[PDB]
Structures are given as structure tokens and as C-alpha cells.
CSV table of N, CA, C and O and ligand atoms in Angstrom, one decimal:
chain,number,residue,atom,x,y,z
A,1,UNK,N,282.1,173.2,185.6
A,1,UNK,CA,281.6,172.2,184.6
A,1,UNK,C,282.8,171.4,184.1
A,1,UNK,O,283.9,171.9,183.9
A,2,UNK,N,282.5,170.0,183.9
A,2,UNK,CA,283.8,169.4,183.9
A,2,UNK,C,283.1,168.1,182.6
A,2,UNK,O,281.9,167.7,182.5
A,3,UNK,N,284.0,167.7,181.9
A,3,UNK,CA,283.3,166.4,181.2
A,3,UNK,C,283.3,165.1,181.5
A,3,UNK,O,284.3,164.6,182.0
A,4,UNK,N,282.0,164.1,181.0
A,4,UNK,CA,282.5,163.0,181.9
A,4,UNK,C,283.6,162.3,181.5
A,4,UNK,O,284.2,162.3,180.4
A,5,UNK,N,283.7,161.5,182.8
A,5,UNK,CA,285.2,160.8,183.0
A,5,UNK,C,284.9,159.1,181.9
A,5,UNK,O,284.0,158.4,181.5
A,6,UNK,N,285.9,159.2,181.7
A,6,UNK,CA,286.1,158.1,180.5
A,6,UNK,C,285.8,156.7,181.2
A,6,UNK,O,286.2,155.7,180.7
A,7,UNK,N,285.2,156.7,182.2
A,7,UNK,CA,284.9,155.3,183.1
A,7,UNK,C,283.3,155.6,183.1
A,7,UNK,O,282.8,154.4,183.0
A,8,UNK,N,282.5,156.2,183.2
A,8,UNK,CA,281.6,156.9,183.7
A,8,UNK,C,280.5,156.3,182.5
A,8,UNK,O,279.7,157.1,182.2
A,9,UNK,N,280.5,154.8,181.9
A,9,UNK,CA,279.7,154.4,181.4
A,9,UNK,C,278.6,153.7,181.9
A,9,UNK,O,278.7,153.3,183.0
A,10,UNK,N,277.2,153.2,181.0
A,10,UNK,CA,276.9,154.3,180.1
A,10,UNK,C,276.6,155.6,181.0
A,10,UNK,O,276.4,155.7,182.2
A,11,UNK,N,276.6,156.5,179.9
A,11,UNK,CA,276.4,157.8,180.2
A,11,UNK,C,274.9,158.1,179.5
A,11,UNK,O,274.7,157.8,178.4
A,12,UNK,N,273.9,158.6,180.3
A,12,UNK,CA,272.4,158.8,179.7
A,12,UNK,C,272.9,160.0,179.2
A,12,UNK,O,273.6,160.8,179.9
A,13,UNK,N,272.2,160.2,177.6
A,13,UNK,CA,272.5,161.0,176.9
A,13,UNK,C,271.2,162.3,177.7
A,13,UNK,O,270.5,162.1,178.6
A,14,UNK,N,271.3,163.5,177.0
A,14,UNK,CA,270.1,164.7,177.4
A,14,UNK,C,268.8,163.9,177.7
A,14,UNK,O,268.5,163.6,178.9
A,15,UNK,N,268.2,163.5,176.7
A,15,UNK,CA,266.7,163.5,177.2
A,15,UNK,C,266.5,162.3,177.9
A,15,UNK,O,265.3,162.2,178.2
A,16,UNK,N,267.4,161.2,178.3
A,16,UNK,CA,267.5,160.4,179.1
A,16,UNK,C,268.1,160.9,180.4
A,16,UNK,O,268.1,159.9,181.1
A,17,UNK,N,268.7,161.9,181.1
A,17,UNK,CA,269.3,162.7,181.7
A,17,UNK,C,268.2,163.8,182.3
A,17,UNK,O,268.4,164.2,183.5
A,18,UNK,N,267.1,164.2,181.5
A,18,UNK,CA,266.4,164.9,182.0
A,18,UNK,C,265.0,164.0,182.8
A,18,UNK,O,264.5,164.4,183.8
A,19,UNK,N,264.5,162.8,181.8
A,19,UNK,CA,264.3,161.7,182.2
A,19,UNK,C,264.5,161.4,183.9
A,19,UNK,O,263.8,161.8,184.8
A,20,UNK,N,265.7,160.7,183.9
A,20,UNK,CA,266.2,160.7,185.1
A,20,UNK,C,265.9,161.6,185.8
A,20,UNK,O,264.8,161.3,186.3
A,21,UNK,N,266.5,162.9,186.3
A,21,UNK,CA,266.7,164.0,187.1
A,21,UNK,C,265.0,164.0,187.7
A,21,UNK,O,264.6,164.1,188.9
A,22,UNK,N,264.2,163.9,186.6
A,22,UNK,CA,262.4,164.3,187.1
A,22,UNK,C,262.1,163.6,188.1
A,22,UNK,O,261.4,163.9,189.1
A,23,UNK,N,262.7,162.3,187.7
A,23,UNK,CA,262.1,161.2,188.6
A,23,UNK,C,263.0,161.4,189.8
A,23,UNK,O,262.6,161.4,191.0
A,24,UNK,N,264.1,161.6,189.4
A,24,UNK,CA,264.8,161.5,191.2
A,24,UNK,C,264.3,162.4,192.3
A,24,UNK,O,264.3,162.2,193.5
A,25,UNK,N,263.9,163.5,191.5
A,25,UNK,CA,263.5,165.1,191.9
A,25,UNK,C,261.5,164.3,192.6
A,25,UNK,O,261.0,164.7,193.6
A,26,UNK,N,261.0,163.6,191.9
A,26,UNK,CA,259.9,163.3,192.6
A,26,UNK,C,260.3,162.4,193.1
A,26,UNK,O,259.6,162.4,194.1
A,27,UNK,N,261.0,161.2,193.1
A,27,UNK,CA,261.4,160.3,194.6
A,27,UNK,C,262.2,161.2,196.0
A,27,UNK,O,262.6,160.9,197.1
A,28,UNK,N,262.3,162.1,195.4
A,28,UNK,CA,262.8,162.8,196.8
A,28,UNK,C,262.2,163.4,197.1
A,28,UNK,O,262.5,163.6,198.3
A,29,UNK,N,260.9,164.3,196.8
A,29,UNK,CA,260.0,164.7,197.3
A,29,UNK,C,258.7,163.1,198.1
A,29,UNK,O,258.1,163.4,199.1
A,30,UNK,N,258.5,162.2,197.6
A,30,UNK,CA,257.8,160.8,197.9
A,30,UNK,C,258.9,160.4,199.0
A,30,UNK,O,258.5,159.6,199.8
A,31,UNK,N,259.9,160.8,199.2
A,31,UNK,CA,261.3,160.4,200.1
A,31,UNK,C,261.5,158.2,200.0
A,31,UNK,O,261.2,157.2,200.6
A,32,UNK,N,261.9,158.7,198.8
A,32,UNK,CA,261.7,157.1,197.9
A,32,UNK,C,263.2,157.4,197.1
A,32,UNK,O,263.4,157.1,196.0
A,33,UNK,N,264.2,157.8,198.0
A,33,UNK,CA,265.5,158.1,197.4
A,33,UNK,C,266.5,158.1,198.4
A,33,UNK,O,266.3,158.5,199.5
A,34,UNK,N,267.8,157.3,197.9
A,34,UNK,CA,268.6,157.2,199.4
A,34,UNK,C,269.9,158.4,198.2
A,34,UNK,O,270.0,158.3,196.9
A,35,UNK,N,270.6,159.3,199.1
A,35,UNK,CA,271.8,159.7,198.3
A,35,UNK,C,273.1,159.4,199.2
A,35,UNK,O,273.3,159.0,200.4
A,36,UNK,N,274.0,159.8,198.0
A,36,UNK,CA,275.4,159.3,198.6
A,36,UNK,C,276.1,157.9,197.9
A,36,UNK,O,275.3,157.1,197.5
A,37,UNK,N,276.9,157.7,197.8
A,37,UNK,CA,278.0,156.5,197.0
A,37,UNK,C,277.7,155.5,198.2
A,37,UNK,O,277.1,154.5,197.9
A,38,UNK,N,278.1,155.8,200.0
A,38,UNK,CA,277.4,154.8,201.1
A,38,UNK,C,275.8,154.2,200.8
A,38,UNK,O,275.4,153.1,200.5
A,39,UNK,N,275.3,155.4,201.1
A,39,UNK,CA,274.0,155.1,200.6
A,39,UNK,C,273.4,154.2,199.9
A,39,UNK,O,272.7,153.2,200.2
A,40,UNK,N,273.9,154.7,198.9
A,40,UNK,CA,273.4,153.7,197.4
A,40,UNK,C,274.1,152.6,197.4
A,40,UNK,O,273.4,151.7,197.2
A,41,UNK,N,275.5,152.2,197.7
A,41,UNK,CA,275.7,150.7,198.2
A,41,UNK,C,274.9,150.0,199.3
A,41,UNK,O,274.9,148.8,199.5
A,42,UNK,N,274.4,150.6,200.0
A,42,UNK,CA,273.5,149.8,201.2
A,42,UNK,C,272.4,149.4,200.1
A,42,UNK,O,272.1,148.4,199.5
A,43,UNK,N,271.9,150.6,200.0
A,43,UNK,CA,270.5,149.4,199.1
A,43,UNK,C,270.9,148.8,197.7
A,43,UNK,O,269.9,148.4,197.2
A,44,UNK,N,271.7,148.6,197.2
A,44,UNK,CA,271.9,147.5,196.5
A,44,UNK,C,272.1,146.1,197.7
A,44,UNK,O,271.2,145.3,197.6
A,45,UNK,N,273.3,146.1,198.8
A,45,UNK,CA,273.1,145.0,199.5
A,45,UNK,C,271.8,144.3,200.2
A,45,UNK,O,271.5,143.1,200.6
A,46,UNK,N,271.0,146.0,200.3
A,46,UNK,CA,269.6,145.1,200.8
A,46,UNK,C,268.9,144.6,199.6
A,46,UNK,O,267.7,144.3,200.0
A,47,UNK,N,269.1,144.4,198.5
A,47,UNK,CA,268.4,144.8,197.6
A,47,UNK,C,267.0,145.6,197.3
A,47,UNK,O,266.0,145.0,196.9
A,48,UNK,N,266.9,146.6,197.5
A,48,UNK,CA,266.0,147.4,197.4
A,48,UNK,C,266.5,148.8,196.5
A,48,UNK,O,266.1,149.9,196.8
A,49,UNK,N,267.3,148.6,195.5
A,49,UNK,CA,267.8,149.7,195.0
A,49,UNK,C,266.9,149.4,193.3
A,49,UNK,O,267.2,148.5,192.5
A,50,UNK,N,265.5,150.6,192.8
A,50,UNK,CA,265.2,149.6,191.6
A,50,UNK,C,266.0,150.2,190.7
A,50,UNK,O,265.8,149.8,189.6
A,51,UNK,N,267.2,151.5,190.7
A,51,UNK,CA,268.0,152.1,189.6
A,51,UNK,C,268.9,152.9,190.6
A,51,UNK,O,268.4,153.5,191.6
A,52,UNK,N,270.5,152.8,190.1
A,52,UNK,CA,271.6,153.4,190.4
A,52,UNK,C,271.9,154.8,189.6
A,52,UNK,O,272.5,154.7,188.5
A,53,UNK,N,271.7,155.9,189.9
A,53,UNK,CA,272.1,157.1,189.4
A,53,UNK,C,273.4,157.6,189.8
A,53,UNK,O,273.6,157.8,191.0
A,54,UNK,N,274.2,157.9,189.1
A,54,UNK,CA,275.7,158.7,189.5
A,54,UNK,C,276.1,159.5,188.3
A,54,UNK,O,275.8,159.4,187.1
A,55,UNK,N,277.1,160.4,189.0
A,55,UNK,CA,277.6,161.5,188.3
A,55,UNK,C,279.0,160.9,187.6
A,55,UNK,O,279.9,160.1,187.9
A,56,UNK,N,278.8,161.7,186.3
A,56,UNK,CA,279.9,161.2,185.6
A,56,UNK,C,281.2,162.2,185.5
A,56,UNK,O,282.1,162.1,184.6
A,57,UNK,N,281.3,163.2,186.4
A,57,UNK,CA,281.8,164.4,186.9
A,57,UNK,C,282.6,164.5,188.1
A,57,UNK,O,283.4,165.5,188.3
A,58,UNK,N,282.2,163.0,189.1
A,58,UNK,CA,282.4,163.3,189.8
A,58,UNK,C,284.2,162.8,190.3
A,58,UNK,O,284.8,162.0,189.7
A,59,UNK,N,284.6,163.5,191.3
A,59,UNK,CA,286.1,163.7,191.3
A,59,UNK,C,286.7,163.5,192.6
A,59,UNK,O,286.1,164.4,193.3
A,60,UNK,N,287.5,162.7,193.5
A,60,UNK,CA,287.9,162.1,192.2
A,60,UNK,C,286.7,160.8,191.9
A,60,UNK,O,285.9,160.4,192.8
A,61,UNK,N,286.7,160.3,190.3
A,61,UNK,CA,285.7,159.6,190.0
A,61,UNK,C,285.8,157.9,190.7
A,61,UNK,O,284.9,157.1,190.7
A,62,UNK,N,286.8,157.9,191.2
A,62,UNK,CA,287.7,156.4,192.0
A,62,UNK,C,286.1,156.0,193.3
A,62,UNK,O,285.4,155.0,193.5
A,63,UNK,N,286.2,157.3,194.0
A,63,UNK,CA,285.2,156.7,195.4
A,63,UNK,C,283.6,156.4,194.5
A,63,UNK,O,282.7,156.7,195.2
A,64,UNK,N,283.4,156.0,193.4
A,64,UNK,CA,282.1,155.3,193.8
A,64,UNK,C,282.0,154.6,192.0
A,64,UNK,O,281.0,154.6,191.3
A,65,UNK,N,283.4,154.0,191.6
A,65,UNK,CA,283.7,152.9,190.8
A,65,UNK,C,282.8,151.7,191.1
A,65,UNK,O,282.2,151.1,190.2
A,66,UNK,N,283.0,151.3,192.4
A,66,UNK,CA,282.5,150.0,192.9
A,66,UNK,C,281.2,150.0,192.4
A,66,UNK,O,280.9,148.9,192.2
A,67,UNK,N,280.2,150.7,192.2
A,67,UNK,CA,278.8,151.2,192.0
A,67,UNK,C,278.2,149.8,190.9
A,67,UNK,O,277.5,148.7,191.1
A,68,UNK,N,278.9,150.6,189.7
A,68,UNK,CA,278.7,149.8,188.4
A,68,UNK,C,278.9,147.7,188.9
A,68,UNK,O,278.2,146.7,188.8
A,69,UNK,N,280.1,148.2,189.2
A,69,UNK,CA,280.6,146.3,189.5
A,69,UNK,C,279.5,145.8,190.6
A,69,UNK,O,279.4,144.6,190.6
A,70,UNK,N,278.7,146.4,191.5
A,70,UNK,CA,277.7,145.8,192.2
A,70,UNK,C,276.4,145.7,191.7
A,70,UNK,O,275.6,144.9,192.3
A,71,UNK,N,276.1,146.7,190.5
A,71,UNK,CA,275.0,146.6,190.6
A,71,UNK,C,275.1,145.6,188.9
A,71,UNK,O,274.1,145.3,188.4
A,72,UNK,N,276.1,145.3,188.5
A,72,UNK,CA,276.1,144.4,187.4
A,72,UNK,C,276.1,143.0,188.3
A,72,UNK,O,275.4,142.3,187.5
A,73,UNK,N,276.4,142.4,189.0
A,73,UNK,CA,276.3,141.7,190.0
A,73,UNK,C,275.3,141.7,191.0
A,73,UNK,O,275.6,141.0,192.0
A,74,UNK,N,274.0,142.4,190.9
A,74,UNK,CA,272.9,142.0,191.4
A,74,UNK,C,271.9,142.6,190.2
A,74,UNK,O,271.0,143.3,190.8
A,75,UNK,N,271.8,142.8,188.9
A,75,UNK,CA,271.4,142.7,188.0
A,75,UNK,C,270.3,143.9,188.3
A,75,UNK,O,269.1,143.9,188.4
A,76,UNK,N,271.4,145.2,188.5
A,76,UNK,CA,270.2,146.6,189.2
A,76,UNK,C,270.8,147.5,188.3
A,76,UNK,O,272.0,147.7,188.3
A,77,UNK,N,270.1,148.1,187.5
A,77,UNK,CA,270.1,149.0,186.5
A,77,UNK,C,270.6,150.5,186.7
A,77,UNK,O,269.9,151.3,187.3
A,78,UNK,N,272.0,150.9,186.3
A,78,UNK,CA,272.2,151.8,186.7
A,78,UNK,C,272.9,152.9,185.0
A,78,UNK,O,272.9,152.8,183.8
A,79,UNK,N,273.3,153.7,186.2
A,79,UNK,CA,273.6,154.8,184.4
A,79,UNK,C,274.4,156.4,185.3
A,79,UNK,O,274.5,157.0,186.4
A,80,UNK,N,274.8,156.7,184.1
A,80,UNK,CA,275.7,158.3,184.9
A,80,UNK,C,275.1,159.2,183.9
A,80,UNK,O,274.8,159.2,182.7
A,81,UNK,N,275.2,160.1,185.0
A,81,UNK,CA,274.2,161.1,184.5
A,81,UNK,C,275.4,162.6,184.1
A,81,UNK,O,276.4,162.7,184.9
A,82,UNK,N,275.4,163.2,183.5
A,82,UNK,CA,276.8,164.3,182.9
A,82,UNK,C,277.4,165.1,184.9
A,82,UNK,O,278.5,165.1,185.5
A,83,UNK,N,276.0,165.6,185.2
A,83,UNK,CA,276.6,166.5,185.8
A,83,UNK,C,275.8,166.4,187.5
A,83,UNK,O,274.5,166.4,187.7
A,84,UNK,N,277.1,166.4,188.7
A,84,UNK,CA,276.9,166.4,190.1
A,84,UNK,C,275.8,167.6,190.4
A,84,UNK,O,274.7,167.5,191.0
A,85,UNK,N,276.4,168.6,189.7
A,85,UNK,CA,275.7,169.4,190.3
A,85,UNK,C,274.0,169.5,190.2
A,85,UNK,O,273.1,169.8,191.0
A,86,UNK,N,273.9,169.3,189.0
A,86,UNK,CA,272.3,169.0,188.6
A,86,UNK,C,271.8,168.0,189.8
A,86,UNK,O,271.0,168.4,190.8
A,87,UNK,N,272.3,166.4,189.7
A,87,UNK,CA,271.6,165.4,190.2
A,87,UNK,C,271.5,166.0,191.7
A,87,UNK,O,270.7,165.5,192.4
A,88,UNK,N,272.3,167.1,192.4
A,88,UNK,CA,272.4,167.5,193.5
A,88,UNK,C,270.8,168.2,194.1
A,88,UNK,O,270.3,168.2,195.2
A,89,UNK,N,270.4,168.8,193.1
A,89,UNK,CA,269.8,170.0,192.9
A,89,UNK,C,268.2,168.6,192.6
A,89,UNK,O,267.2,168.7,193.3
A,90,UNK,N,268.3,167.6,191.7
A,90,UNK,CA,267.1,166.6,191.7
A,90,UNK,C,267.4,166.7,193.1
A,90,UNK,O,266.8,167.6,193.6
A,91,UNK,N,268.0,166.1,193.9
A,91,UNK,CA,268.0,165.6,195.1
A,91,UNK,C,266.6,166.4,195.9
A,91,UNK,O,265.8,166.2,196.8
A,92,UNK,N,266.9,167.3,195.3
A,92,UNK,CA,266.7,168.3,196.5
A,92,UNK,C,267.3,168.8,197.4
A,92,UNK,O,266.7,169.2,198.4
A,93,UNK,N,268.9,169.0,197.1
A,93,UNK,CA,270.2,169.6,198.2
A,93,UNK,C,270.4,170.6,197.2
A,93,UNK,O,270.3,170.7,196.0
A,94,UNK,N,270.9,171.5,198.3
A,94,UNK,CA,272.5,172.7,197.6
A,94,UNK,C,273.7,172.2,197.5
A,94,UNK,O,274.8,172.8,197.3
A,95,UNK,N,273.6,171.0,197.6
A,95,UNK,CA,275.1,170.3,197.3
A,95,UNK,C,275.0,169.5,196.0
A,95,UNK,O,273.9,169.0,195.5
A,96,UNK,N,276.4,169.4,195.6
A,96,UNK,CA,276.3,168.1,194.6
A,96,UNK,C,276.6,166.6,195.2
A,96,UNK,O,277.3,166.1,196.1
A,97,UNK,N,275.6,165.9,194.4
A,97,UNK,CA,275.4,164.5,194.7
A,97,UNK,C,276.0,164.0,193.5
A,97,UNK,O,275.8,164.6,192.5
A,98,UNK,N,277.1,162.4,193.6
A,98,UNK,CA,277.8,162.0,192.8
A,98,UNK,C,277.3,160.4,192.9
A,98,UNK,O,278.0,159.5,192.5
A,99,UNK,N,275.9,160.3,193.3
A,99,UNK,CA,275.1,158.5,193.9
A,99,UNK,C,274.3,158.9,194.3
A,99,UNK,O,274.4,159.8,195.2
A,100,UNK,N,273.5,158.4,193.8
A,100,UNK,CA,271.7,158.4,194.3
A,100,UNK,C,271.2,156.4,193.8
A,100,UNK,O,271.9,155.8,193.0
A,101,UNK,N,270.3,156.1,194.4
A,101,UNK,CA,269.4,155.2,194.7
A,101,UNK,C,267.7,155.1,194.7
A,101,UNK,O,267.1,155.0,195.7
A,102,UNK,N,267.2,155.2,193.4
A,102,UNK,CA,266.0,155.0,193.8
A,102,UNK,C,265.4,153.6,194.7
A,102,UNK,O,265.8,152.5,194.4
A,103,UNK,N,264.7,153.7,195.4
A,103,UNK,CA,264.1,152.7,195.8
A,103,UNK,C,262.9,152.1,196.3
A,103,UNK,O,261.9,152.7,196.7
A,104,UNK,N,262.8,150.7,196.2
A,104,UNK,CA,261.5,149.5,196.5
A,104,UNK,C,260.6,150.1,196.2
A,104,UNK,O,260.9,151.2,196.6
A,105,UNK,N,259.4,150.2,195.9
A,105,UNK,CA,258.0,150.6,196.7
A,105,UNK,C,256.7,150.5,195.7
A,105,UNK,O,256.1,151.4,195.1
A,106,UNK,N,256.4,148.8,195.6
A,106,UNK,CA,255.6,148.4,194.5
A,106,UNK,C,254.1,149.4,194.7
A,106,UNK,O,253.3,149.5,193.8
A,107,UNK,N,253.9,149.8,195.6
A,107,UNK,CA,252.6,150.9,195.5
A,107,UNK,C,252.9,152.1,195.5
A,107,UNK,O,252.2,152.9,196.1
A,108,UNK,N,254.3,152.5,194.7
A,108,UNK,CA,254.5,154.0,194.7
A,108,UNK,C,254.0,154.6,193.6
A,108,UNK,O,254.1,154.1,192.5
A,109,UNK,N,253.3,155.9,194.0
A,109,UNK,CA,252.5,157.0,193.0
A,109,UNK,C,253.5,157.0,191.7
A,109,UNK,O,253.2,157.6,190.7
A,110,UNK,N,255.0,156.4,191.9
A,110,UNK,CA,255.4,156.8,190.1
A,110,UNK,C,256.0,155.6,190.0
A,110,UNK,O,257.0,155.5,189.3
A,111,UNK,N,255.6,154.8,190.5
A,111,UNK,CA,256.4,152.7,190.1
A,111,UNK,C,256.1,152.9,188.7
A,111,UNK,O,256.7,152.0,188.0
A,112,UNK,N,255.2,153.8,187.8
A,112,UNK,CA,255.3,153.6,186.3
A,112,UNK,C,256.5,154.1,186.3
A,112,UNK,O,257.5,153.4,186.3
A,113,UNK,N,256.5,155.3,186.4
A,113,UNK,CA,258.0,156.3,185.7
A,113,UNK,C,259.0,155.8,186.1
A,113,UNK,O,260.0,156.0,185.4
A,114,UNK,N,259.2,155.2,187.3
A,114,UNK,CA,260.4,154.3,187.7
A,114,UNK,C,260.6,153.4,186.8
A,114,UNK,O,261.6,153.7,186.1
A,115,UNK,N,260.0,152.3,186.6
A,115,UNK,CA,259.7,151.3,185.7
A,115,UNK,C,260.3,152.0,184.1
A,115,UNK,O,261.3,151.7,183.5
A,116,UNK,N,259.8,152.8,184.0
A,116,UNK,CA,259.8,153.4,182.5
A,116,UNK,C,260.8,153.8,182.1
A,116,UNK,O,261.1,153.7,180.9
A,117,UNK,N,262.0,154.5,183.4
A,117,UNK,CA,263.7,154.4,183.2
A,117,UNK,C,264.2,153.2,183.4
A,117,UNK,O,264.9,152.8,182.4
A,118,UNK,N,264.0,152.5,184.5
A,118,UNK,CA,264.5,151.3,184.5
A,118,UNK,C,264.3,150.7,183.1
A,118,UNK,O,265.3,150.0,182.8
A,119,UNK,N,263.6,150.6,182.5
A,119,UNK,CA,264.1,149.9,180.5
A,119,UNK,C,264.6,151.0,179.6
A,119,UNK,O,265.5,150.9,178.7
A,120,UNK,N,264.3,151.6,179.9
A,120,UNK,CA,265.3,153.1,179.4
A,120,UNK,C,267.0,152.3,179.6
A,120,UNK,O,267.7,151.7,178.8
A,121,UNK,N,267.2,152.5,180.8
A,121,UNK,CA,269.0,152.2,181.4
A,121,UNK,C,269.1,150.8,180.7
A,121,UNK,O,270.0,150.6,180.0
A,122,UNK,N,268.1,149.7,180.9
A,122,UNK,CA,268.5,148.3,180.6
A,122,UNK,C,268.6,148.2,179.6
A,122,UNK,O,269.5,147.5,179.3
A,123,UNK,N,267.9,148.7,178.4
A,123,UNK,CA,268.0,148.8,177.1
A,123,UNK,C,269.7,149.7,176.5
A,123,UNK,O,270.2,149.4,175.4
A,124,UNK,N,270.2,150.4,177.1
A,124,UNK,CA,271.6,151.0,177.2
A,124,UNK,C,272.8,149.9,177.6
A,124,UNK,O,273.8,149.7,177.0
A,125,UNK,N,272.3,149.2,178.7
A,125,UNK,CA,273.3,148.1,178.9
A,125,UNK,C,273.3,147.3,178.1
A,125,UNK,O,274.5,146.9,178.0
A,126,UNK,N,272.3,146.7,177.1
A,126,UNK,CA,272.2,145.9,176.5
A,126,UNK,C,273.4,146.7,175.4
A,126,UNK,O,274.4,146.1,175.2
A,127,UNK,N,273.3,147.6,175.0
A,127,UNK,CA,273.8,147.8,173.8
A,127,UNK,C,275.7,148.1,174.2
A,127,UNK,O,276.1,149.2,174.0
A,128,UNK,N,276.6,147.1,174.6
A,128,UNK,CA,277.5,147.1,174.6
A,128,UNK,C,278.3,147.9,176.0
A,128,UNK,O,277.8,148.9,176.4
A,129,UNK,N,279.2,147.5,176.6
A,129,UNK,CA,280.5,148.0,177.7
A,129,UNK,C,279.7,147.8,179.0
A,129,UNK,O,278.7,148.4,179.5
A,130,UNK,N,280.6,146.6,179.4
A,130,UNK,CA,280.5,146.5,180.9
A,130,UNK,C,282.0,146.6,181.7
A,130,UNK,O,283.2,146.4,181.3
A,131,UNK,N,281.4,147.0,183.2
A,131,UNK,CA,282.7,147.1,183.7
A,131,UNK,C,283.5,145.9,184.5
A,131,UNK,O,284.5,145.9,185.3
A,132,UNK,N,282.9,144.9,184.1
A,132,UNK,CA,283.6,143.4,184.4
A,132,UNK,C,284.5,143.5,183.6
A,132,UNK,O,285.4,142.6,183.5
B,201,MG,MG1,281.5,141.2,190.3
């Protein structure tokens, strides 16, 4: 357990954190989730990414910086979540995941709950620190 890194804004506090994790944990079972720092920059470039998840833990924290600066530059809602190991375990892996991607799918069984983080995170951006 490690705390997050002082770049790793914003940071979704607990019950936005748990929030998150549910939903990623049912886009990966719907397989409506891409993981990985690769990953999740491809669908931002296709645009099909509707929220950026990453770990604020993760080490070194350098390989998936670029995240924030892309997805502020195609106006895609993202946020860091405290801990790899958890978001690993939403995934549905025994590994830790340090980037996840939800994605596209205007007839998906949880486009509410998607929707419902995505103003969740945009309402956080709104309230101050970007990485421009
Ligand atoms: Mg830019």
C-alpha cells in the first residue's frame, strides 16, 4: 500500500472510488472495458473511451501521465482512483491495473451508471487543477 502520487489528480475520494470500481467490475463482466495505459490510449484515439480510470499508486507513476493530457484534449472524463491493486481485482485480474477505459455502447445494460460517474468525475474537474 502506497499513497497517491502528488500528480495523480483528481483523485475520487471513497465513495466515488467505490462508485467507480462497481461499474468497472460490471463493464468487465458486459466486456465493455479495455485495461492497460496502451489500451486506454487507443480508445481515447478512437474515441470511444466514455471515462478514464487510473491508479494513483501506480509506479513508476511517469508511464501513464500522458492519460490526463489526452483525455483533457478530447474532453473524456477521467479521475485516479487510490489503489492498483483494487482497480486490478474490478477488472477482474489477479494483477494490478494502473488504466482502465470504459467504453462506447449507447444500448448498454448500465449506460445509466456509466453516465452517472461520468458527472460524478466532470463535476470534480470542474472544481479546479488541470494538467495543462
Ligand atoms: Mg494537449
Amino acid at each position: 500500500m502506497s499513497a497517491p502520487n502528488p500528480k495523480a489528480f483528481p483523485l475520487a475520494d471513497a465513495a466515488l472510488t467505490q462508485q467507480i470500481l462497481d461499474v468497472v467490475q460490471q463493464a468487465a463482466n458486459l466486456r465493455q472495458l479495455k485495461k492497460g495505459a496502451n489500451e486506454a490510449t487507443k480508445t481515447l484515439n478512437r474515441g470511444i473511451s466514455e471515462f478514464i480510470i487510473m491508479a494513483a499508486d501506480c509506479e513508476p507513476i511517469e508511464i501513464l501521465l500522458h492519460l490526463p493530457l489526452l483525455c483533457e484534449d478530447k474532453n473524456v472524463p477521467y479521475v485516479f482512483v487510490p489503489s492498483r491493486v483494487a482497480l486490478g481485482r474490478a477488472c477482474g485480474v489477479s494483477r494490478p491495473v494502473i488504466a482502465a477505459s470504459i467504453t462506447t455502447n449507447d444500448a448498454s445494460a448500465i449506460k445509466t451508471q456509466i453516465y452517472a460517474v461520468k458527472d460524478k468525475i466532470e463535476t470534480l474537474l470542474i472544481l479546479e487543477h488541470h494538467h495543462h
